[PDB]
Design a binder for these strands. Structure first.
Ligand code: MG
Ligand code: MG
Ligand code: MG
Ligand code: MG
Ligand code: MG
Ligand code: MG
Ligand code: MG
Ligand code: MG
Ligand code: MG
Ligand code: MG
Ligand code: MG
Ligand code: MG
Ligand code: MG
Ligand code: MG
Ligand code: MG
Ligand code: MG
Ligand code: MG
Ligand code: MG
Ligand code: MG
Ligand code: MG
Ligand code: MG
Ligand code: MG
Ligand code: MG
Ligand code: MG
Ligand code: MG
Ligand code: MG
Ligand code: MG
Ligand code: MG
Ligand code: MG
Ligand code: MG
Ligand code: MG
Ligand code: MG
Ligand code: MG
Ligand code: MG
Ligand code: MG
Ligand code: MG
Ligand code: MG
Ligand code: MG
Ligand code: MG
Ligand code: MG
Ligand code: MG
Ligand code: MG
Ligand code: MG
Ligand code: MG
Ligand code: MG
Ligand code: MG
Ligand code: MG
Ligand code: MG
Ligand code: MG
Ligand code: MG
Ligand code: MG
Ligand code: MG
Ligand code: MG
Ligand code: MG
Ligand code: MG
Ligand code: MG
Ligand code: MG
Ligand code: MG
Ligand code: MG
Ligand code: MG
Ligand code: MG
Ligand code: MG
Ligand code: MG
Ligand code: MG
Ligand code: MG
Ligand code: MG
Ligand code: MG
Ligand code: MG
Ligand code: MG
Ligand code: MG
Ligand code: MG
Ligand code: MG
Ligand code: MG
Ligand code: MG
Ligand code: MG
Ligand code: MG
Ligand code: MG
Ligand code: MG
Ligand code: MG
Ligand code: MG
Ligand code: MG
Ligand code: MG
Ligand code: MG
Ligand code: MG
Ligand code: MG
Ligand code: MG
Ligand code: MG
Ligand code: MG
Ligand code: MG
Ligand code: MG
Ligand code: MG
Ligand code: MG
Lengths: 68, 275, 114, 100, 88
RNA sequence: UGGGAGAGGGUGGUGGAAUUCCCGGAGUAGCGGUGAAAUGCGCAGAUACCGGGAGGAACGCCGAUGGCGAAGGCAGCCACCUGGUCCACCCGUGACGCUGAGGCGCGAAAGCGUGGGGAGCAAACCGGAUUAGAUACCCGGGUAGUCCACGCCCUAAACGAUGCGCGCUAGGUCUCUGGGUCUCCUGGGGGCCGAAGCUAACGCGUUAAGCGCGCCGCCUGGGGAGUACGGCCGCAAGGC
């Protein structure tokens, strides 16, 4: 159930697109591994980087509590 | 950057002098000087009341503007930076567009040619003065008044600064140079930046002579005296203290707190100094 | 008296501490491996947590408490059993969340964690 | 000259006048540091993923600009001075990286 | 950094003939350009040792060329280092 | 000329989690710790919980058998300044090359000097355990230091225990990053298994420890000893 499949064209570099980016975050707020995002090495590197910017803008969490 | 000497005398070996690099004008404004009447540490009864003072170089007093709220809104150009024998900071000559000229203590980074201004609407920039309440929390500041309109009392020595830590109603919380945490009324003026000549504390006097030039006469130990003179006086040969170390007047001098307990400002002091 | 509140489970390898609060987060009661009577390493056992969670729940219900939200911190052995005991106590356990503190690589840990 | 994206989160609890004043300080600043605005997008309020200045929301501004390289760190500094400005982030503009 | 235009200007100024790129004078001049820009950089960033290696390499490179150029034609050598103010 | 990737370096900013401390609230009989304990902390209100604040250090997930650098080494994010490097075009120069005694520069940690900073950790040190004893291992404390600037020190299992450059000698497979026409092909890295060959063996094998050429460094039984003496360097420690 790899996240990259559930989306069409998106900008790997768009740090404002909270809606797309929040897909690549686990339920605990963490950045998802390649095995969940289906991204290549090169694309994952861009994803991580723009996720971190979005967190600094306040658009994505750094962490979330885990509900059971 | 303090200036060193080659050891071509026993004293030049250790002596260091300020480099005087920020200084652009070597003569004071004639209309802003008045004679400094030397006291020798004597009061109006003629008595020594602070020991070991006198005999230092002649000095003229430079009138310093410690108000600033005096000329709100009126910008001034920094005309020069000068030496002031009466304080550790350097001083900066201001030419107000008014035509009025005054001195302030020179902040770190102040440039001749630059413009400064005082008031609630002043930009937050080195050399400008504002009431504390309009200065952003976190900015480091100097020449701080303690009570509104009474004049700058705080952080005036070379290299010193206070930092705005927060706000609480009519007051703002400062970290003083000493590390003391204190409320100061928001209407108190301060000047953004730190006091300049930060290298002041690295100067090595080098020889007894240099202290004399400064008006500091030799300090003599209580242990070097006789019992008529001092608690530590007397004893055959050298002697240890033989009692709690004391002042010439008998009060203890290692730890004994001396600030008055029931002082009204205690309500405004949040945390006593560090270190 | 508070009908709803929170249950905090501080569970370490050495002990389990349970403190029931009000909805604002202010403690009404608390209990632990020490309170129900254990000393030493015994306080870190699952049974200890069980007695602790119960005694804390019992005390809490005595103030009218009926529902709680369970907040869990720590990787102790007595963890799950405390959660268990809260459920099987007579309180509603409206929710269960782990809020265990984890640094984003802050302070150097003591020697034993390296 | 290079193209940047100035991101700004403002105090979400200002009135539209103070808000307008802040936007004004910002715009004069942009101009003063020689930044030529090209596009601009004002998204306004947004639920934040976490509190900023102990507040659940933030008021978002966004300017694609073109300005001189050397002045941008200074620009950002000037922008951050006002209390009601709670974040500034100036990024180099990039070509999008597309997946799929 | 150093722009496309500025590089062009140097190249055309030292080019031996209309299209000339990669000749010694052009190489030395391009290196002389980078060298002087880096020198200024290192004056402010005294602690950038890694880029300083870069400087040594460039200096080394220019040195070899100038030995070569001076080997071949002393005339173009003397005129090149003068046109650049290099010896010392 | 046109592009690419990257924790390469330097400078200025800036974000969140966590630890500690301080303030306010709420609450009570323990908490902490270990193999088990005790020291310690706690009714002078600790621990656990909530809100506020201060401050220093390190950057979770991404993260990898990954990337970059000559080596040391480099990891939140932004900007500026700056080095190396790869590719495609095959456009210019015309052997301009390789190595390199001396020299110069860089060089983890610890250490040193001057000044700042100090949350956590922690030599020395103090105490509790353990033990026959325990100047240790474990536990509770704890100062330098760890961090910043500038200046020194110049060492190391500074390792691939493998000098640099070039040419030549089956392939299979995983991977990073370019260019194709995108099946796959071809460059440059990083691994693994292996042709021939090498090797005392273990192993190495187009990232050679194979086959060759060039230049440098180095070894010549163990201890004495990286010691002594001399010299040079260093504030010292001590280095060569
Ligand atoms: Mg100076
Ligand atoms: Mg000298
Ligand atoms: Mg001297
Ligand atoms: Mg001299
Ligand atoms: Mg002499
Ligand atoms: Mg002497
Ligand atoms: Mg001088
Ligand atoms: Mg001066
Ligand atoms: Mg004179
Ligand atoms: Mg007169
Ligand atoms: Mg007169
Ligand atoms: Mg006077
Ligand atoms: Mg007088
Ligand atoms: Mg009189
Ligand atoms: Mg009299
Ligand atoms: Mg008399
Ligand atoms: Mg006296
Ligand atoms: Mg006197
Ligand atoms: Mg002076
Ligand atoms: Mg001085
Ligand atoms: Mg001194
Ligand atoms: Mg004097
Ligand atoms: Mg004295
Ligand atoms: Mg004396
Ligand atoms: Mg005597
Ligand atoms: Mg007498
Ligand atoms: Mg008497
Ligand atoms: Mg007496
Ligand atoms: Mg005596
Ligand atoms: Mg005696
Ligand atoms: Mg005596
Ligand atoms: Mg005696
Ligand atoms: Mg005597
Ligand atoms: Mg004596
Ligand atoms: Mg004597
Ligand atoms: Mg004594
Ligand atoms: Mg005595
Ligand atoms: Mg005595
Ligand atoms: Mg007294
Ligand atoms: Mg007062
Ligand atoms: Mg225990
Ligand atoms: Mg601000
Ligand atoms: Mg974009
Ligand atoms: Mg080069
Ligand atoms: Mg030459
Ligand atoms: Mg190019
Ligand atoms: Mg409290
Ligand atoms: Mg708290
Ligand atoms: Mg990892
Ligand atoms: Mg690797
Ligand atoms: Mg590499
Ligand atoms: Mg050609
Ligand atoms: Mg030809
Ligand atoms: Mg050498
Ligand atoms: Mg070193
Ligand atoms: Mg170190
Ligand atoms: Mg050290
Ligand atoms: Mg020391
Ligand atoms: Mg030190
Ligand atoms: Mg000393
Ligand atoms: Mg120190
Ligand atoms: Mg400390
Ligand atoms: Mg001991
Ligand atoms: Mg014992
Ligand atoms: Mg014994
Ligand atoms: Mg011990
Ligand atoms: Mg210990
Ligand atoms: Mg400790
Ligand atoms: Mg010591
Ligand atoms: Mg020391
Ligand atoms: Mg020492
Ligand atoms: Mg250093
Ligand atoms: Mg060496
Ligand atoms: Mg290794
Ligand atoms: Mg290697
Ligand atoms: Mg070796
Ligand atoms: Mg060699
Ligand atoms: Mg490709
Ligand atoms: Mg490929
Ligand atoms: Mg390969
Ligand atoms: Mg193999
Ligand atoms: Mg074989
Ligand atoms: Mg052989
Ligand atoms: Mg082949
Ligand atoms: Mg192969
Ligand atoms: Mg290789
Ligand atoms: Mg071999
Ligand atoms: Mg031997
Ligand atoms: Mg030796
Ligand atoms: Mg040795
Ligand atoms: Mg010797
Ligand atoms: Mg050696």
């Amino acid at each position: 159930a790899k996240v990259k499949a559930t989306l069409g064209e998106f900008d790997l570099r768009d740090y404002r697109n909270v809606e797309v980016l929040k897909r690549f975050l686990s339920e605990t707020g963490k950045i998802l591994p390649r095995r969940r995002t289906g991204l290549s090495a090169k694309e994952q590197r861009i994803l991580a980087k723009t996720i971190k910017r979005a967190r600094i803008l306040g658009l994505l969490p750094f962490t979330e509590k885990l509900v059971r | 950057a303090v200036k060193k000497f080659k050891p071509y005398t026993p004293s030049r070996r250790f002596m260091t002098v300020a480099d005087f690099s920020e200084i652009t004008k070597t003569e004071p404004e004639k209309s802003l000087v008045k004679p400094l009447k030397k006291t020798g540490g004597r009061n109006n009864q003629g008595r020594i009341t602070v020991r070991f003072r006198g005999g230092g170089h002649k000095r003229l007093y430079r009138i310093i503007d410690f108000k600033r709220w005096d000329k709100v809104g009126i910008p001034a150009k920094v005309a020069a930076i000068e030496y002031d024998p009466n304080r550790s900071a350097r001083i900066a000559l201001l030419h107000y567009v008014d035509g009025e000229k005054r001195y302030i203590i020179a902040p770190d980074g102040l440039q001749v040619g630059q413009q400064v201004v005082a008031g609630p609407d002043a930009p937050i920039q080195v050399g400008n003065a504002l009431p504390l309440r309009f200065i952003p929390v976190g900015t480091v500041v100097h020449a701080v008044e303690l009570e509104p309109k009474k004049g700058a009392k705080l952080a005036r020595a070379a290299g010193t600064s206070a930092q705005i830590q927060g706000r609480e109603g009519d007051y703002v919380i400062l970290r003083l140079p000493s590390g003391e945490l204190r409320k100061v009324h928001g209407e108190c003026y301060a000047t953004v930046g730190a006091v300049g000549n930060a290298d002041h504390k690295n100067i090595v006097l080098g020889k007894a002579g240099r202290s004399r030039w400064l008006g500091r006469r030799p300090h003599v130990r209580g242990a070097a005296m006789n019992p008529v003179d001092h608690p530590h006086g007397g004893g055959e040969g050298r002697a240890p203290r033989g009692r709690p170390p004391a002042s010439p007047w008998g009060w203890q001098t290692k730890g004994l707190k001396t600030r008055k307990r029931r002082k009204p400002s205690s309500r405004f002091i949040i945390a006593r100094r560090k270190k | 008296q508070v009908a709803s509140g929170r249950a905090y489970i501080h569970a370490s390898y050495n002990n389990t501490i349970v403190t029931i609060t009000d909805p604002d987060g202010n403690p009404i009661t608390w209990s632990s491996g020490g309170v129900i009577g254990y000393k030493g390493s015994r306080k870190g056992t699952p049974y200890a947590a069980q007695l602790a969670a119960l005694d804390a729940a019992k005390k809490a219900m005595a103030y009218g408490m009926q529902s709680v939200d369970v907040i869990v911190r720590g990787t102790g052995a007595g963890r799950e059993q405390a959660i268990r005991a809260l459920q099987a106590s007579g309180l509603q356990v409206k929710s269960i969340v782990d809020d265990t503190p984890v640094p984003h690589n802050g302070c150097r840990p003591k020697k034993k964690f390296r | 000259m290079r193209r940047y994206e100035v991101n700004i989160v403002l105090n979400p609890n200002l009135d539209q006048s103070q808000l307008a004043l802040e936007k004004e300080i910002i715009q004069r600043a942009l101009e003063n540091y020689g930044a030529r605005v090209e596009k601009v997008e004002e998204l306004g309020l947004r639920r934040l993923a976490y509190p900023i200045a102990k507040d659940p929301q933030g008021y978002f501004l966004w300017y694609q600009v073109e300005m001189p390289e050397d002045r941008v760190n200074d620009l950002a500094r000037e922008l951050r001075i006002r209390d009601n400005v709670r974040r500034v982030m100036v990024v180099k503009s990039q070509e999008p990286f597309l997946a799929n | 950094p150093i722009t496309k235009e500025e590089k062009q200007k140097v190249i055309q100024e030292f080019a031996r003939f209309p299209g000339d790129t990669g000749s010694t004078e052009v190489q030395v001049a391009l290196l002389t350009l980078r060298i002087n820009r880096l020198s200024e950089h290192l004056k402010v960033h005294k602690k950038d040792h890694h880029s300083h290696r870069g400087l040594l390499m460039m200096v080394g490179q220019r040195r070899r060329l100038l030995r070569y150029l001076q080997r071949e034609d002393p005339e173009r050598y003397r005129a090149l280092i003068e046109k650049l103010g290099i010896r010392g």
